[PDB]
Amino acid sequence: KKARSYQIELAQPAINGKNALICAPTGSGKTFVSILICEHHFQNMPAGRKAKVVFLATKVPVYEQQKNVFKHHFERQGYSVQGISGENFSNVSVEKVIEDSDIIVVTPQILVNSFEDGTLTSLSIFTLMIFDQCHNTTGNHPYNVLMTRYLEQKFNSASQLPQILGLTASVGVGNAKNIEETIEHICSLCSYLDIQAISTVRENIQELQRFMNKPEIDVRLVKRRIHNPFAAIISNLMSETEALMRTIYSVDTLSQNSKKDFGTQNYEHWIVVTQRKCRLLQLEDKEEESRICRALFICTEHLRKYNDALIISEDARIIDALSYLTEFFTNVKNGPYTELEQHLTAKFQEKEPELIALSKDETNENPKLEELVCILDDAYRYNPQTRTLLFAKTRALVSALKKCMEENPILNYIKPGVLMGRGRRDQTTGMTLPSQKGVLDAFKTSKDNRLLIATSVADEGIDIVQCNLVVLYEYSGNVTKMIQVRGRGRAAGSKCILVTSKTEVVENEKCNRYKEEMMNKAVEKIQKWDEETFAKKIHNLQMKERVLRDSRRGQKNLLCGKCKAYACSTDDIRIIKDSHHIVLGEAFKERYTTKPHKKPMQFDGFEKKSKMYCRNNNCQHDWGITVKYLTFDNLPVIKIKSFVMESTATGTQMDFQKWKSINSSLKNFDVEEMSNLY
RNA sequence: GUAGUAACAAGAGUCUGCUUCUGCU
Ligand SMILES: *O[C@H]1[C@@H](O)[C@H](n2cnc3c(N)ncnc32)O[C@@H]1COP(=O)(O)OP(=O)(O)O
Ligand SMILES: Nc1ncnc2c1ncn2[C@@H]1O[C@H](COP(=O)(O)OP(=O)(O)O)[C@@H](O)[C@H]1O
Ligand SMILES: [K+]
Ligand SMILES: [Mg+2]
Ligand SMILES: [Zn+2]
């Protein structure tokens, strides 16, 4: 309720009407600073003008959190405060919420769509726009789509633009190596948001430092297993699988050779590149093309899972890596299970007895995992009230760590929670926002559930109880990530421990510390510039971007991406709402089969009904979903990643991961056209 | 369906990833 002195300081450039970037630590009260700026803004409007304020948040939970904050603060003062996100875009009309509210809180895509659809024509409808996590204003991020529009209006110079406020804990350094390059990076970000001043705590630092304690860092380098018989057995299986592939087809006319760097990210990326090349193989004999493509698809999928298991074993237990394989092979056994699949499964099952034996050898436990357990034991022994956030990179690793921490509870009583990002498409892994909230509620209040294991979903945004320990388990990243994760343990006495067996990860954390100091010094040098100097720099970058932006601004058969069977013509596709690609006609119904959808999501007016698969029982490739839409109970919606495209002109096959390059040649859905097909 | 100056990169004479992760609609 009562503003801190550093908060009044941070607010000053914005109160004086300048577009301002507030750079200050996570949890230091930047949102409250924006509230101060808003109060002043409302009270100092020129005559005949009423303020209209929009607050943008990148994440639905942050939208909800900040909407509640603005409601509580400003409704008592007679102000109308409303929110729009994807949830309520079905009920809500955007223009009318804007008309009726003094403050709108939104996710940015809501606005983008309302410009796209002509509902909104000018950003001059707002007098103040507040960008939470404004460092996201880059590329084709929704933030940068909106600011591009702002700058297009600014260039046409026939309108009053809203004042801009950006909130961030880190402006970043980009790829800079020195203070000069860092300054350029920071001016770049400022240029995208039309910033006129950067506001940091400079006069009231000792107050700031009282509220925000940088957690104490520990970087622990640990050893790998002395011997790795599990890795040797899997690596040999991988070698044999590559040799099998080469007997099926000379893949080195299609992709390069592997370096046999099994169990690395480089090998992963190699498999995925090789998969792409294999699926684009073309032969005169279409039967043989299908047979070879399918076989190579299978070989590469198997190589991938072995590579995955190696990586799991490096970070977790042998039994975790083995579990992952046995669950994969169960899936293989229940699928098409063609001869090649039976063979690969039998080759694994030959080794399985020995692998099981290896997985019970306690003397070869993962040293990194042992260190992690010692860390947690020490923490909870010292302070039973500890709450810990344990970060790890992959869904698979977080799942393995959950299993470890549940089978073997810390001090035989601490229980883990798990937080992952949302399940995408058909993923059994992943969590809805309600599930996410449930986990965090338990973590916040439970007596024994005092450990949260998380992917990057926990980095920032969603409200999490303060943690006095944060453990980064092989969890490296850039200086902005470093800075954000600090906000999870910003309580006096908090600690942050990084555990790795990799000297590169240690070196990475050293470089982050150097970058953060470089970033802070660059900001200081920029703040010595007068307004004239700053504005001239930002104008120059804006014109460069304008000129770049300006100088940028055939019929195909779709074939199953696995077995190469004919699916449909581009002529048959219709686009719904610029996004969803349906296929018309009776012919196409012969080409696919369906099963009930496991998770009947709704979105953009569709009821998900079924999953859609290649009709070839020896293939069963996932092609998309079927939906109900309007008066139509059964529409197939294809996903571009499931197919290879073949030019009816050249006969050449191509790969597309987005529809963008193709959409131009496709017709839009027309309810009248559709209505006539029944 | 789409985004990321997030991950991890590997390549091409500043451009490129569909992988990892997360976000949004
Ligand atoms: O190409 C896909 C899209 O047109 C549509 N779809 C699926 N998921 C989404 C989300 N999250 N937002 C917008 N549009 C979506 O469905 C097409 C098929 O995708 P997929 O087969 O992966 O759907 P799924 O239900 O996840 O299996
Ligand atoms: N002056 C203040 N008095 C009381 N609580 C404050 C004050 N400033 C910030 N807080 C609290 O600190 C927390 C973090 O503030 P927030 O604005 O969300 O931080 P940031 O946006 O910098 O991450 C919030 O719960 C907020 O209520
Ligand atoms: K068939
Ligand atoms: Mg990197
Ligand atoms: Zn198929």
CATH, residue A62 = 3.40.50.300
Burial class (CB in 10 A: 0-12, 13-18, 19+), A92: middle
Ligand nearest to the CA of A25: 2
Q: How was this structure determined?
A: X-ray
Residues A452 and A370 reside in one and the same domain:
yes
Statement: the CB of A67 is under 7 Å from strand B: no
Residue A571's identity, in one-letter code, is D
Domain CATH number, residue A656: 2.170.150.30
| Phi, psi of A475, deg, nearest 5 | -110, 90
Alpha carbons within 13 A on the beta-carbon side of A335:
22
How far, in Å, CA of A165 to CA of A169, rounded? 14
How far, in Å, CA of A282 to CA of A253, rounded? 12
| Phi, psi of A543, deg, nearest 5 | -70, -40
Which of A32, A65, A73, A466 for mutating ligand 2's site (highest number of atoms within 8 Å of CB)?
A32
Cβ contacts of residue A49 below 8 Å, gap of 6+? A127
Residue A570 within any structural domain of the chain? yes
Residue A108 within any structural domain of the chain? yes
**Closest to A646 (Cα-Cα) out of A560, A588, A574, A581:** A560
Ligand 1 is surrounded, with C-beta below 6 A, by: A 425-426, 579-580, 603, 608, 624-625, 637, 639
Statement: the CB of A481 is under 7 Å from strand B: yes
Range of the domain at A240: 229-363
- Note the CA–C1' distance, A86 to B23, in angstroms: 13
Residues A131 and A202 reside in one and the same domain:
yes
A 10 A CB-CB count for A421 gives 16
How far, in Å, CA of A421 to CA of A395, rounded? 9
| Ligand 4 centroid from CA A476, angstroms | 8
Measured CA to C1', the nucleotide nearest A423 is: B22
Q: At what angle do helices A318-334 and A395-407 cross, to 10 degrees?
A: 120
A 10 A CB-CB count for A136 gives 18
Which of A87, A626, A639, A657 for mutating ligand 1's site (highest number of atoms within 8 Å of CB)?
A639
Residue A510 within any structural domain of the chain? no
Residue A449 within any structural domain of the chain? yes
How far, in Å, CA of A390 to CA of A376, rounded? 10
Residues A253 and A338 reside in one and the same domain:
yes
How far, in Å, CA of A257 to CA of A252, rounded? 6
Answer yes or no: are the C-beta atoms of A164 and A154 closer than 8 Å: no
Of A363, A390, A420, the residue at which a domain comes to its end is A363
Residue A20 within any structural domain of the chain? yes
CA quadruple A6, A8, A13, A14: dihedral sign: positive
Domain count, chain A: 4
Residues A632 and A496 reside in one and the same domain:
no
How far, in Å, CA of A457 to CA of A477, rounded? 14
Answer yes or no: are the C-beta atoms of A155 and A501 closer than 8 Å: no
For strand A580-583 and strand A632-638, is the pairing parallel, antiparallel, or unpaired? Answer: antiparallel
Of A341, A363, A385, the residue at which a domain comes to its end is A363
Three-class secondary structure of residue A655 per DSSP: coil
How far, in Å, CA of A179 to CA of A175, rounded? 11
Residues A238 and A206 reside in one and the same domain:
no
Residues A539 and A632 reside in one and the same domain:
no
To one decimal, the resolution in angstroms is 1.7
Domain CATH number, residue A263: 1.20.1320.30
Three-class secondary structure of residue A75 per DSSP: helix
Residues in chain A: 678
Burial class (CB in 10 A: 0-12, 13-18, 19+), A207: middle
Of A342, A363, A384, the residue at which a domain comes to its end is A363
Answer yes or no: are the C-beta atoms of A458 and A452 closer than 8 Å: yes
Q: Which residues pair with A197 in a beta bridge?
A: A20
Residue A581's identity, in one-letter code, is H
DSSP-assigned letter for residue A569: E
How far the first Cα of chain A sits from its last, in Å, is 63
- Considering only residues 566-595 of chain A, list those whose CB is below 7 Å from strand B: 578-581
Residues A543 and A609 reside in one and the same domain:
no
Residue A114 within any structural domain of the chain? yes
Integer-rounded Cα radius of gyration of chain A? 28
Residue A521 within any structural domain of the chain? no
Residues A154 and A266 reside in one and the same domain:
no
How far, in Å, CA of A458 to CA of A276, rounded? 33
Residue A412 within any structural domain of the chain? yes
| Ligand 3 centroid from CA A622, angstroms | 14
What number of H helices and E strands is found in chain A?
Answer: 22, 25
C-alpha A130: how far from its chain's center? 22
Buried residues in A593-613 as b, exposed as e (16+ CB within 10 A): ebeebeeeeeeeebebbbbbb
CA angle at A121 for the pair A119 and A127, rounded to the nearest 5°? 110
- Note the CA–C1' distance, A394 to B20, in angstroms: 7
Answer yes or no: are the C-beta atoms of A371 and A220 closer than 8 Å: yes
Token pair listed for A72: 């509580």
Buried residues in A74-85 as b, exposed as e (16+ CB within 10 A): beeeebebbbbb
Residues A34 and A177 reside in one and the same domain:
yes
Residues A124 and A13 reside in one and the same domain:
yes
| Phi, psi of A425, deg, nearest 5 | 60, -105
Residues A493 and A621 reside in one and the same domain:
no
Residues A281 and A415 reside in one and the same domain:
no
| Ligand 5 centroid from CA A304, angstroms | 20
A 10 A CB-CB count for A539 gives 12
